[PDB]
Structure formats: C-alpha cells, structure tokens
Amino acid sequence: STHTLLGQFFQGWGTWVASWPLTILVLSVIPVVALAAGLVFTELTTDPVELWSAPNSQARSEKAFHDQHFGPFFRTNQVILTAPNRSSYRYDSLLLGPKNFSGILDLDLLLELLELQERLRHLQVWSPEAQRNISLQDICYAPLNPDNTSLYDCCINSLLQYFQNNRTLLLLTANQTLMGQTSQVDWKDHFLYCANAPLTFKDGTALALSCMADYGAPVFPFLAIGGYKGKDYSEAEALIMTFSLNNYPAGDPRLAQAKLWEEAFLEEMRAFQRRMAGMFQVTFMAERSLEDEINRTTAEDLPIFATSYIVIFLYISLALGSYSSSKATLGLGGVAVVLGAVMAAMGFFSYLGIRSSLVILQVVPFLVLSVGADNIFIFVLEYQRLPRRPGEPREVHIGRALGRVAPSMLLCSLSEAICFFLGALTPMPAVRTFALTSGLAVILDFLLQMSAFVALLSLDSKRQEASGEGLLLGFFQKAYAPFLLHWITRGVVLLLFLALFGVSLYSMCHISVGLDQELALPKDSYLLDYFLFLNRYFEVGAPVYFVTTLGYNFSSEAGMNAICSSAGCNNFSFTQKIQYATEFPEQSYLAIPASSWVDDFIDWLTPSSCCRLYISGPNKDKFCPSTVNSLNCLKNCMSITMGSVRPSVEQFHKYLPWFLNDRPNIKCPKGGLAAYSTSVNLTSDGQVLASRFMAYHKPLKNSQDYTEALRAARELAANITADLRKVPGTDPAFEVFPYTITNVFYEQYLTILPEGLFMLSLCLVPTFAVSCLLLGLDLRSGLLNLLSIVMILVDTVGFMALWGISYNAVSLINLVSAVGMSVEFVSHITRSFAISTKPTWLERAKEATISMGSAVFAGVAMTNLPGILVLGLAKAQLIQIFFFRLNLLITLLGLLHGLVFLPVILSYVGPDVNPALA
C-alpha cells in the first residue's frame, strides 16, 4: 500500500538518525545558520504604499500613460481649521440681503491664519545630501510659471487668496450709497461676491478689488471653505489651506528634497496646534504622512510580541512532564527548531533581493510558531504513550514511534505549505511575499523537526538513564468522552452544529468587501482626526481626469462638435454627458462638471479683442497679446459674422499654442495657461497627442464608495469612448479612461469576489486528494473531514461578517491558511478512527476521542493560543483586526468542530472496521 511504504521508510530513517544523534544535529543547523546569516546582506524593507497595488494590472497601466504624457500627480499638504466654541452672527449685505455668518469667518481668526500661511511660505530646510537650504520655490507646483518659479508663484489654495494674501486689502473698507443706502461694504461682501463668481477680475462692489489668487489661477469655493450645504457659503464651518508640491519618480534626488520639506511643515503645524489650543481646532496631513504612520510601530511592537516565544517555551516542559513528586531541554529544542526555520526562510529571500514588508516582520514569526510546534506534541506524546517492547534498544523504539505518527505530520505540514503557496497568487505584493515566506518557513520547519528534533529527542532519551497515565490522558478524557458520547448529547450536538452551519450560511451574505484606510493606522494617530474632519466637512472628493488616448483628430469641425458644449454642438457630447452625469450624483459619483479646453479655446477664438494680429511693421503677423493698448492691433485672429465659429485646420495648428500660453488678465479672462497649460500634450509640428479633462468626485467616505465611484466613472468613460469612435477620422483603439490618484488601490475590489471563490475552492482539491493518498482514508471518511473543513470555512465567514471584519486581500490569505490548518484538527482524529478495532462504532469513536483527542487539544489548540493572543495588543488596527480576530475565531471554531462534532459524526457514518494487520 502507499501508506505502509511511507511509514516503513520513516521508521528506518528515525532509527538511523537516533543512532547518530550528535552528527545529524550539528550537520543540520549549519545550513540554517548559513541561510539565517543573510538577514543583514540584502535585508531591505519596502516602506511606500506601492506594496498595495498590482504592477501588471489595468489601473497601473493607465497611471503609466498619464505619468508619461502629462507628468505625475502633485502631492498634497492640507490643514482643516474649525472654531468649535464660536457663535454665528447676522450681517446685512448691500447686495445679498440678510445673511448669517459662521463663527469661523472672522477677522480675528483670518489674520491668525494669514500669519500661519505666510510663515509656512517662508520655510527652509537644510538638506544634508545636497549642501543647500531647500526653499518652497524649488519644490512647489507652479502652474503658471514652472521655469523660473518665484516664491509667489506657488500653488497655495485658501480663503485668503481672494484678497491675494494682502493684509491691507483684507482690512479695506468702502462706503457705497447704492439705492440711497449708505452701507459700509467690508471684506465679507467681496468674499460673498468671489464665492459665487470665482473668475472675476474686478469686484462688483464699491471697493474694486480683484478676485483671483496671486499665482494667477482662480480658486474655487470648494478648495477654500467646507462644511456648507447647497450654496450658502457664509455658513461654512471649516477653513482649508492646501500646499501642493511637485511629484517625481522614486529615483530622482528632488524627491528627497520634497519629502524633507514636509517634515518641517509637520513640525510647524504641530507648533501651531500647541500654540492655538483655545482658539482653533486644527487637523493636518502631509503627502508623506500616510507612508510613515503605517510602518511606524513595526520596531515598537516586536519586543512586546517576543514574549509569545517565552510563553510557548514555558508551555512545553510542563505539559510534557511525568510529574509524580521535566523535559526542559525539549521546550528549548522546540523553540529553536521553530525560531531557526523562521529566520532561515526570512533570510533566504533576502539573498534573492525580494524586499520585505511590515506584515512579514509582525505576523510571520508568531504565526509560524502557532503551527510549528503542532507536530512536536504529536511526536512526543506518541513517544511516551507507546510502551517499549521487551529487549529492544531505545533507537528502534524511537524509530517505531516516529514511523507510527509521521505520515500525519507530513500530511499536515504539506497541506499547510500547499495552501500558503497556492494562496500567493494574489496580485498585491505585500501579501504575496508574506505567503511565500510562510510557505518556505513551514517547509523548513517540517524538514528541521524531522532531522534535528529527532536527534535531540534521542539525546534527551539517553539522559533519563542517569538524571499513572498522567491527568489529561485518562483523568479527564475518560470522564469527558462518556459525556460527549452519551446518547442524548449525541443527537443534540448533531443538530446544534447543523443549525450553526445554516445560520452562518445565511449570515455570510451580509459581508462587506473592501478595506478602509482608517483601519490601517495606529490608534493613537493624528491622521484619524484628519480623516474624521475630511469625511465630515469637505464638499468635493478627489479630482478626476478623463484622459483621451492618442488617435482622435481634434482639428476637424466634426471632431470639435463631438466635444464642445456651446452653440452648434452635437447633442450627448463629451462635456454634455459629463454635465448630465453630475445632475444625479448618487448614481454617477461626480460633483463638478468637466472643464474642457476645447470649449474655452472656442470661446477664446471669438473676436472680442482677446486674439489679435498686428496690421504691419517689423513684426507682421506673429502675435498681439491682450496687454497691448496700441492702434496696430485692429485685426482679429478669426473672422466675423458667422454662427458657431470654428477654426480651420491650418488655424487650429497655429492658434492653439498661443492659447495655451496666454495669461488671463482684466482685458482677457477668456482662458489660457491658468488651467490648460499642462492638460494638453503637443507634438513637434503642433498636433495634439493626448488631452485630459478635469472633474471632481463627490465626497467618498468608506471603501465601497471608492469602488462604486471607480466603476461608475469607468462606465461613463466607456459610453463616451463608444460614442467618440463613430466620428469619422478617429482610428480604433482610441479610448477615454478616468484617472484618479486612488484608483490603483481600489481597483482590486471590482473582481476580488470571483478571485476569492476560485482560490479558496482550488485549495480543497489538494487537501482531500492528498489526504486519501498519504493516509489510509479511502472514501467514506475521506469526504467527511472535507465536510468538516467546509463547515469551518462557512462558520468562519459567517462570524467574520457578524463581528464586522471586511473581506479584503489581507483576510483572504487568512482564510486560505485556515483551510490548510483545519486538516490538523480533523485528520488526526479521523485517522485514529480508521485504524481502530472495536465491536461497535460507539466504542471506536470513544477510543478515537480518548487517544488522539487529548493530544490534539493539548498540542494543537493550546499551542497556537499564545501565538494568537499576543497579537491582540498590537497598536495597529490591521494586525489587531485581521490577524487576531480572524485567527482567534478559526482556532475556536476549528477546535470546536474537530473535537465535539467530528467524534459524534464518526459514531454514525464512520468507515467500516478493516482488519488492517499489515
């Protein structure tokens, strides 16, 4: 038979290893030390948040195209101020009637915010790598002037940009006698005017102030104030101040300069928070802030987690005693064989240049320990329970006791390694390396404890020469087994577990898919207050870019008519569809309509002294800008007296680069480089390669909102690209896709549910087939522990839905490690039933419960409890939610099915009594 060959081979190998104890022990730990010595050579940790995105997916290929053709998305540094204990007040405007003002909108707070903003603009950091102070101008994102980049050209959005950050303009006052009403027009009137019409160059009040920021572009009200509802901007309860910086690829030396400045920004806002405790209530965030708040507690929690090894050392050599009136070296050997394998499997990957993560250094050594000492108890308890035959050496006895139990050990370890390796097909790189390291650690643990631990046990066995049945074996399990096999409980348990399975089957349909970003940070984190204020007070989400890939013409009148929204444009166009989709912002997750450069280019070509050509001179026809008050510019770019003015193909190639460099002013606010300078890529001749259109999501709170917004945006872009291909001239493969800064993270949840069912169902096939081959499990009890594993998975999914654990890529690998761990709870009990010889099924189930049930409870259920309970106090919600709540719920469910349900079900439909003398 296939079973008896393997057991007959393991009996020879163990008795050979026990005859050379010192040689096999020293010769095995040498490769373990050689593998674990690579923890210093190329041990590198991948700190960014690109450990959470598949690099060969569609969402990362769209990011590569947008980064190639337009440059990467800018970094963000935000502060959200609130005045909690300030009362609102009434104010009567000269143009808007009575209007109530919130407590935050006051001069006494706006002046303090102006002082803080002007101090942040002059910050400087001493760069160690490049010997020079880093100023804000060198790394700020300036849309209107990227070449010179003076200190006042940086993009800084706030409410004080309406007044251009001038303290004298903020305190300005005028007396307007409108309609026979002498009313003091103040800054609040100008703020009310700029909130309704942000693209204003002269205010429509008595004080004729401007309305646009000092860097040139107009600022919209949803980037300055927040917390309103509708269009009453005077009731705003929050103030926003955003600093945006240039983003570079990771190899660039400017990235270290840009991240160096944000540390000084965070220190300055911490000083502002401490200095203004009784006036404001600030919450802040830098672009580097989420990257270092995630892996901040990796080196802080390891010494707390290292006491699990001491507890598992103390648990062995107290439950393995022969206490009459201690096996302390066996516990040290069990700890060293588990500790050696983890360091060897972790350091082998460092040689190959595979970068580790935070989860590898936090759950790997305390999850391998929970399934690494599992075979040690099953070997040592079988060594002491098998009595020595008369006149035989200790080596043959150790070989016989090893050969009787080791195929179940090989089956459990190989099922563990198969489930970890098969579960490493997830696209996310943080979970792939964790599964690969856990699989290699489990395989090295199985090799180490079958070659070195047997030699250590043979060495310890000799020692007892120089220097009752216990209590757990017979004094409890011979007074619990009649309880469980009483004929009233034997029917009650059989329907109670069935009702539990049915209730979990109903309750697993209320599960939620997706991992919130609030559940990744430590509990005493400052970013949680920022995420609370962001979800409560903002009125728009992240920006959306509807990128158009190369292939569209853009130069024909048939091409422009499918994009524009003005007069003489086709119905259901690009901008028309994006305009329509924001009228129902619950189906489509858009809040602001798309701003199209083609419409502003068509409006800019209308002859209103905004595009003019020289009549004659030294410069005949090159360009007359808007800032020229001369008599030689009486010639429009386009002609006059047509409806739906569309430029020719020659005129489109000529007038377009002048439009994308024109700076808006009082005599020409029609458009230019304030918004569309970086939204269009031009070729060498002047042909448009690719463009992009800007729109804003609605506020996305949870992680399902991000997935629904991404799916709705991709569906709307699919409708737009379907309609755009019918225009004559555009070639196939032209597509319009929506690009957002957070689509790489949340694109996995579109199709993680079919991926989870396939990968989980693919692990049951090499758990039942291999169990029927390495063991004597033929067919009746072969598909019974599979039923136990399916019940364990369904009950775990139901309780995971009930507790409030979302189903994501982190929890999916824990379920795959549970299907490889539940074989350990049921294969030992089922195999002991199969080799039983008793008259009736009830006594066979009683013998199976007494013999291996006590060993399974004392070495498989109490061995992983120190390794799992230590993670419950872990400082990070991801480790404390997915690797503690899930694993604790699997060990209790796995113990409760493999020790109360499997013996009861085996006394009804168990396999027949084979003689089995071979």
Ligand X SMILES: CCCCCCCCCCCCO[C@@H]1O[C@H](CO)[C@@H](O[C@H]2O[C@H](CO)[C@@H](O)[C@H](O)[C@H]2O)[C@H](O)[C@H]1O
Ligand Y SMILES: *[C@@H]1O[C@H](CO)[C@@H](O[C@@H]2O[C@H](CO)[C@@H](O[C@@H]3O[C@H](CO)[C@@H](O)[C@H](O)[C@H]3NC(C)=O)[C@H](O)[C@H]2NC(C)=O)[C@H](O)[C@H]1NC(C)=O
Ligand Z SMILES: *[C@@H]1O[C@H](CO)[C@@H](O[C@@H]2O[C@H](CO)[C@@H](O)[C@H](O)[C@H]2NC(C)=O)[C@H](O)[C@H]1NC(C)=O
- The answer to whether residue 114 forms part of the interface with ligand CLR (CB under 6 A) is no
- Token pair recorded at residue 567: 């007069």
Cβ atoms of residues 468 and 325 within 8 Å:
no
Q: How far apart are CA 513 and CA 748, in angstroms?
A: 10
Contacting residue, 716, 784, 800, 881, with ligand NAG by CB under 6 A: 716
Q: How far apart are CA 366 and CA 908, in angstroms?
A: 38
Closer to ligand X by Cβ: residue 244 or 781:
244
- Token pair recorded at residue 302: 């390891």
Closer to ligand Z by Cβ: residue 159 or 602:
159
Query: Left (φ > 0), alpha (ψ -120 to 50) or beta: where does 501 sit?
Result: alpha
Residue 22 burial (10 A CB sphere; 0-12, 13-18, 19+)? exposed
Interface residues with ligand X (CB under 6 A) are 49, 52, 76, 78, 290, 294, 359, 430, 517, 520, 534, 542, 741-742, 745, 878
71 binds, among ligand Y, ligand CLR, ligand Z, none (CB under 5 to 8 A by kind): ligand Y
Nearest approach, Cβ of residue 678 and ligand Y (Å):
8
343 binds, among ligand CLR, ligand Z, ligand Y, none (CB under 5 to 8 A by kind): ligand CLR
Q: How far apart are CA 781 and CA 810, in angstroms?
A: 33
- Token pair recorded at residue 140: 């700020």
- The answer to whether residue 1 forms part of the interface with ligand NAG (CB under 6 A) is no
> Considering only 151-159, 417-425, 832-840, 849-857, which stretch makes contact with ligand CLR by CB under 6 A?
417-425
- By C-alpha distance, which of 249, 258, 252, 255 is closest to 67? 249
Q: How far apart are CA 871 and CA 265, in angstroms?
A: 34
- Token pair recorded at residue 829: 């009990």
68 binds, among ligand Y, ligand CLR, ligand Z, none (CB under 5 to 8 A by kind): ligand Y
Closer to ligand X by Cβ: residue 307 or 535:
535
Positive or negative, the CA dihedral 247, 250, 252, 253 is positive
DSSP string, 727-774: STTPPTT--EEEE-TTHHHHTGGGSHHHHHHHHHHTTTHHHHTTHHHH
- The answer to whether residue 583 forms part of the interface with ligand NAG (CB under 6 A) is no
Residue 54 burial (10 A CB sphere; 0-12, 13-18, 19+)? middle
Nearest approach, Cβ of residue 707 and ligand X (Å):
13
- The answer to whether residue 43 forms part of the interface with ligand CLR (CB under 6 A) is yes
Q: How far apart are CA 285 and CA 242, in angstroms?
A: 10
Nearest approach, Cβ of residue 584 and ligand NAG (Å):
9
Contacting residue, 100, 322, 326, 661, with ligand NAG by CB under 6 A: 100
- Token pair recorded at residue 794: 């369904």
Residue nearest to ligand Y (CB): 556
- The answer to whether residue 837 forms part of the interface with ligand NAG (CB under 6 A) is no
Continuous segment of H or E residues that includes residue 175: strand 174-177
Task: Report the greatest alpha carbon distance in the chain.
Answer: 123
Q: x/- binding map, residues 343-372, to ligand Z, per CB under 6 A?
A: ------------------------------
Nearest approach, Cβ of residue 169 and ligand Z (Å):
5
Cβ atoms of residues 733 and 546 within 8 Å:
no
Contacting residue, 200, 375, 553, 785, with ligand Y by CB under 6 A: 553
Instruction: List the interface residues with ligand Y, window 670-709 (CB under 6 A).
Output: 681, 689
Q: How far are the Cα atoms of 171, 219, 227 from residue 224, in angstroms, in the given order? A: 19, 8, 11
Nearest approach, Cβ of residue 91 and ligand NAG (Å):
9
Closer to ligand NAG by Cβ: residue 715 or 843:
715
571 binds, among ligand CLR, ligand NAG, ligand Y, none (CB under 5 to 8 A by kind): ligand NAG
Contacting residue, 89, 126, 572, 803, with ligand CLR by CB under 6 A: 803
Cβ atoms of residues 561 and 570 within 8 Å:
yes
Nearest approach, Cβ of residue 275 and ligand NAG (Å):
13
> Considering only 289-297, 425-433, 444-452, 715-723, which stretch makes contact with ligand NAG by CB under 6 A?
715-723
Closer to ligand X by Cβ: residue 749 or 799:
749
Q: How far apart are CA 401 and CA 379, in angstroms?
A: 8
- The answer to whether residue 103 forms part of the interface with ligand Y (CB under 6 A) is no
> Considering only 34-42, 166-174, 266-274, 881-889, which stretch makes contact with ligand Z by CB under 6 A?
166-174
Closer to ligand CLR by Cβ: residue 223 or 441:
441
Angle 572-575-578 from CA coordinates, rounded to 5°:
85
438 binds, among ligand X, ligand NAG, ligand Y, none (CB under 5 to 8 A by kind): none
Nearest approach, Cβ of residue 423 and ligand NAG (Å):
35
Contacting residue, 111, 123, 169, 772, with ligand Z by CB under 6 A: 169
Cβ atoms of residues 334 and 316 within 8 Å:
yes
- The answer to whether residue 122 forms part of the interface with ligand Z (CB under 6 A) is no
Q: CB-based contacts of 856: which residues, under 8 Å, 6+ apart?
A: 378, 824, 825, 828, 829, 898, 899
Contacting residue, 43, 47, 232, 715, with ligand NAG by CB under 6 A: 715
Contacting residue, 19, 57, 166, 719, with ligand Z by CB under 6 A: 166
Nearest approach, Cβ of residue 687 and ligand Y (Å):
7
Nearest approach, Cβ of residue 663 and ligand Y (Å):
19
Query: Left (φ > 0), alpha (ψ -120 to 50) or beta: where does 179 sit?
Result: left
- By C-alpha distance, which of 505, 519, 530, 524 is closest to 804? 519
Continuous segment of H or E residues that includes residue 80: strand 75-81
573 binds, among ligand Z, ligand Y, ligand NAG, none (CB under 5 to 8 A by kind): none
- The answer to whether residue 27 forms part of the interface with ligand CLR (CB under 6 A) is yes
354 binds, among ligand CLR, ligand X, ligand NAG, none (CB under 5 to 8 A by kind): none
Cβ atoms of residues 781 and 830 within 8 Å:
yes
β-bridge mates for residue 157, sequence order: 242
Nearest approach, Cβ of residue 625 and ligand Z (Å):
23
Closer to ligand Y by Cβ: residue 689 or 772:
689
Q: How far apart are CA 87 and CA 110, in angstroms?
A: 16
- By C-alpha distance, which of 469, 541, 447, 564 is closest to 741? 541
Closer to ligand X by Cβ: residue 52 or 280:
52
Closer to ligand NAG by Cβ: residue 182 or 629:
182
Instruction: List the interface residues with ligand CLR, window 326-365 (CB under 6 A).
Output: 343, 346, 361, 365
Q: How far are the Cα atoms of 61, 748, 755, 762 from residue 425, in angstroms, in the given order? A: 20, 13, 10, 11
Cα torsion at 633, 638, 639, 642 (round to 10°)?
A: -140
Nearest approach, Cβ of residue 119 and ligand CLR (Å):
35
Strand, helix or coil at 218? Answer: coil
Closer to ligand X by Cβ: residue 117 or 743:
743
Instruction: List the interface residues with ligand CLR, window 294-323 (CB under 6 A).
Output: 299, 302, 306, 309
**Residues binding ligand Z (CB under 6 A):** 166, 168-169
Contact positions toward ligand Y, by CB under 6 A? 68-71, 553, 555-556, 649, 681, 689, 729
* Chain residues that interact with ligand NAG, rule: CB under 6 A: 84-85, 98-100, 124, 133, 147-148, 173, 175, 182, 184, 278, 281, 571, 588, 712, 715-716, 719
Binding site for ligand CLR (CB under 6 A): 24, 27-28, 31, 39, 43, 45, 299, 302, 306, 309, 343, 346, 361, 365, 421, 424-425, 447, 451, 799, 802-803, 889, 892-893
